Design brief:
This is part of a larger assembly, with chains A, B and C. Chain A is an all-alpha fold. Chain A has 23 helices and six strands. In chain A, helix 3 runs parallel beside helix 4, helix 18 runs parallel beside helix 21 and helix 21 runs antiparallel to helix 22. The chains are: A mainly alpha, B mainly alpha, C mainly alpha. Chain C: It is found in: Cytoplasm, Cytoskeleton, Microtubule organizing center, Centrosome.
Chain lengths: 620, 59, 158
């Protein structure tokens, strides 16, 4: 077979470029290929003889034709680019015998396409799976030669003719034909790793109603499953793979915790194709927990053997799946804690302190008023570390993660400007917890902090102007302020006691009921996405009614007042702008309330507690 | 004691080999752990021979 | 449990190559023979009684070693009590005996011809063993080369 040299070269180069886990695998010596005498396959006129001499001569040469031995009155013609041998009988053969000979010739034809696999297609370039296929096809060819020798001994005693040979070879063309069918389909087309094992789960289902050939196909694939089982006896129980023969579904990549081990589509056997997702996960958890300083072994482990259409060997795989993702979870939650880490995220992004922020707001009010790049970051880190130590919060050790973070935007960092709207936090995370929480979650926590900041921020503005007037018998500003104040404290009651704190409380129970890393990743993404969507950020307009309400609140309190511009702290000119702001405020308030009503609740349900400005006009 | 019971396990091997008992290292470990419970060994001598008979009954 | 160690005894003494129904029947065999004796002299003295038959059959240093080990194991009592009951049913140069060329001030006894003749027998048993292998390798294969075809292979059953 001339193709084989090209096949070895292409195979070797294909293996080598993908991963450098092993190179320069041995090419078997040249004299192996050059001799056709290391491979199992490479007179007188018969026309005037008596009939019985003809039958005895032809059975004699046919027994040579069954092996790679030249016949006495027949020869083997050279093959071509063709596969199986044809043979060249002697002219003037009998027309009775010629038909019977072509019934016996299929044994030699089913022997030609057997030894060419064994005597070549077993080497390292071909993978580590053509090895054991030529290591249980060799025993059968040994059996073939055994049978041929036992026949020859009877032929020497005058006890063989064509008819006894014809009876004898029906076991040798109901069995060797199965091999000569399987061999020329495994060889044609690259069958490496799981693709062979799918073809032998297809051709061990081709015989389930014969029962003669079914056991034989099960025997062939029970030897071909053994090196795959060898690789499966590492990956499930350790993180260790070497495998430069790429016979396995998981491939070692030479480059972290999701970019190293990856399923390959044509390296999956058919009877584990349903279980293909569990294999990679169960294997990956053991290696990545050793990446964070832990054991890698799976002390529940057994040895694995194939069975046609019955399962006991995809069973122990589930018992290591019931160890790996449960020892990694139990590693994370109590060692290098995710509970205290999440609470230290809660303390600032969900703004669990009211103390630390009012300290911060008083200390930084002048700097918060100034625009960005008119700010002093080293002074603000000192003031933050002061205001933190003054408050309750000093007890967690992860308080140091806070640094000064500028994000000059007006929520155009969506999932010049002022210092209040360019304040965020960057939080450092550890390598074990980086596996779950990453840049996306941190971005969403930052955006949530940005939305909550304005609600915290406008409250200081109301309280300052509220105390500064108290003059003591005036009520012109005290109506617009009271309406806006009731609104901006009820938004603040709704959001935390509804949108944030109960579901954070639910999530901290749900994580203790998880069993997979996938499970934790479900619960966390549910909370983080839906609660941020629940607060007023989602629309294509992104709910500008909220921002314009906050804008007229701040414009009323500070931009137009400046605490009656230190007039005593005239023509009631300041009261007319209160009236104009108040009409604009009624418009914005109704726009937000009607928008929340029209989309398919509780902030409307409690703001309008007994018919409190619930009707002034209504849509449609 | 953990030093002593590895050395006594090693010397215990030789007198099981030269007395021509059926035990190898694995079955010696099984039998030393089994006698540690408190079983009479003259009883164990019969169940080992009955296992080795009925094993040959299959093959 | 103790009845679980009897399953591990069945596991070592039967390897795997069916093979899920034989082990429960062997577990029954392990249980059924233990309790018939239970319904119905020191320890090292029997060791001396077995070293005696060794010395009767020649082979001096083996008896001298067997007595050497029980002397220091008394200087685990129930496990050697099992070995004396499992005895004899399992699987089983030097130039200072009849070579007087080495040593320091070698013993003077005149010459030897009566143990030097049993120094060839020490090799003659090896020469008689390594020919019995080649008698048992030519026999197992002449049992294949000569037969009516396919009575040692199940290929006629396919």
């Amino acid at each position: 077979l001339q193709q084989s040299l090209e096949l070895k070269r292409k195979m070797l180069r294909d293996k080598q470029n993908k991963k450098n886990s092993g190179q320069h695998l041995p090419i078997f010596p040249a004299w192996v290929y050059e001799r056709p005498a290391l491979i199992g396959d490479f007179a007188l006129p018969i026309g005037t003889l008596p009939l019985a001499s003809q039958e005895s001569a032809v059975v004699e040469d046919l027994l040579y034709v069954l092996v790679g031995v030249d016949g006495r009155y027949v020869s083997a013609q050279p093959l071509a680019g063709r596969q199986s041998r044809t043979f060249l009988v002697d002219p003037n053969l009998d027309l009775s015998i010629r038909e019977l000979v072509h019934r016996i010739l299929p044994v030699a034809a089913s022997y030609s396409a057997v030894t060419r696999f064994i005597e070549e297609k077993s080497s390292f370039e071909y993978g580590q799976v053509n090895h054991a296929l030529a290591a249980a096809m060799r025993t059968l060819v040994k059996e073939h030669l055994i049978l041929v020798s036992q026949l020859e001994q009877l032929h020497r005693q005058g006890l063989l003719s064509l008819q006894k040979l014809w009876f004898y070879i029906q076991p040798a063309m109901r069995t060797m034909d199965i091999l000569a069918s399987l061999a020329t389909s495994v060889d044609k087309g690259e069958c490496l790793g799981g693709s062979t094992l799918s073809l032998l789960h297809d051709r061990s289902f081709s015989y389930t109603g014969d029962s003669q050939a079914q056991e034989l196909c099960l025997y062939l694939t029970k030897a071909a499953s053994a090196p795959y089982f060898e690789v499966l006896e590492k990956w499930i129980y350790r993180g260790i793979i070497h495998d430069p023969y790429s016979e396995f579904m998981v491939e070692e990549h030479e480059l972290y915790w999701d970019q190293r081990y990856t399923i390959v589509q044509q390296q999956i056997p058919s009877f584990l194709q349903k279980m293909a997702d569990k294999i990679l996960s169960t294997g990956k958890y053991l290696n990545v927990v050793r990446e964070c300083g832990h054991d890698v072994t799976c002390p529940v482990a057994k040895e694995i053997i194939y069975t046609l259409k019955e399962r006991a060997y995809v069973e122990q795989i589930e018992k290591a799946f019931n160890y790996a993702s449960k020892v990694l979870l139990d590693f994370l939650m109590e060692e290098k804690e995710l509970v205290a880490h999440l609470r230290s995220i809660k303390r600032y992004f969900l703004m669990d302190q009211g103390d630390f922020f009012v300290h911060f707001m008083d200390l930084a009010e002048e700097e918060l008023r100034k625009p960005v790049e008119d700010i002093t970051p080293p002074r603000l880190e000192a003031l933050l570390e002061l205001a933190l130590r003054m408050s309750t919060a000093n007890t967690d050790p992860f308080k140091d993660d806070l640094k000064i973070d500028l994000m000059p935007h007006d929520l155009i960092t969506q999932l010049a400007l002022s210092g209040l709207e360019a304040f965020s936090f960057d939080y450092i995370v550890k390598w074990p917890l980086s596996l779950i929480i990453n840049r996306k979650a941190l971005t969403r926590y930052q955006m949530l902090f940005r939305h909550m900041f304005y609600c915290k921020h406008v409250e200081r503005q109301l309280c300052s102007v509220w105390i500064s007037n108290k003059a003591q018998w005036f009520a012109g500003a005290f109506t617009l302020r009271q309406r806006m104040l009731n609104f901006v404290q009820n938004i603040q009651y709704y959001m935390m006691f509804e949108v944030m704190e109960p579901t954070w409380h639910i999530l901290e129970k749900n994580l203790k009921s998880a069993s997979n890393i996938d499970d934790v990743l479900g619960h966390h993404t549910g909370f983080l996405d839906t609660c941020l969507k629940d607060c007023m950020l989602t629309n294509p307009e992104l709910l500008k009614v909220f921002s314009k309400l906050m804008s007229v609140c701040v414009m009323f309190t500070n931009c137009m007042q400046k605490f009656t511009q230190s007039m005593k702290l005239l023509v009631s000119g300041f009261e007319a702008t209160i009236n104009k702001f108040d009409k604009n405020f009624s418009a914005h308030l109704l726009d937000l309330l009607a928008r929340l009503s029209i989309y398919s609740a509780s902030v409307i349900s409690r703001l309008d507690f007994n018919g409190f400005y619930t009707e002034r006009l209504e849509r449609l | 004691n953990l030093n002593a019971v590895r050395e006594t396990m090693d010397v215990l091997l030789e007198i099981s080999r030269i007395l021509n008992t059926g035990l190898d290292m694995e079955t010696l470990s099984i039998c030393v752990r089994l006698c540690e419970q408190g079983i009479n060994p003259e009883a164990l001598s019969s169940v080992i021979k009955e296992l080795r008979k009925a094993t040959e009954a299959l093959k | 449990s103790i009845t679980q160690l009897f399953d591990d005894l069945c596991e070592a003494l039967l390897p795997a190559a069916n093979r899920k129904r034989a082990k429960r029947s062997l577990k029954k065999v392990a249980y059924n023979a233990l309790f018939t004796n239970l319904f119905q002299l020191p320890a090292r003295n029997k060791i001396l009684m077995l070293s005696f038959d060794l010395r009767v059959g020649g082979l001096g240093p083996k008896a001298d070693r067997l007595e050497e080990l029980v002397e220091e194991l008394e200087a685990v009592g129930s496990v050697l009590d099992l070995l004396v009951q499992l005895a004899g049913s399992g699987p089983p140069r030097d130039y200072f005996l009849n070579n007087k060329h080495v040593g320091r001030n070698v013993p003077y006894s005149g010459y030897d011809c009566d143990d030097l003749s049993v120094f060839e027998m020490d090799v003659q048993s090896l020469i008689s063993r390594e020919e019995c292998l080649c008698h048992s390798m030519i026999q197992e294969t002449l049992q294949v080369m000569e037969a009516a075809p396919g009575t040692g292979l199940p290929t006629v059953g396919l």
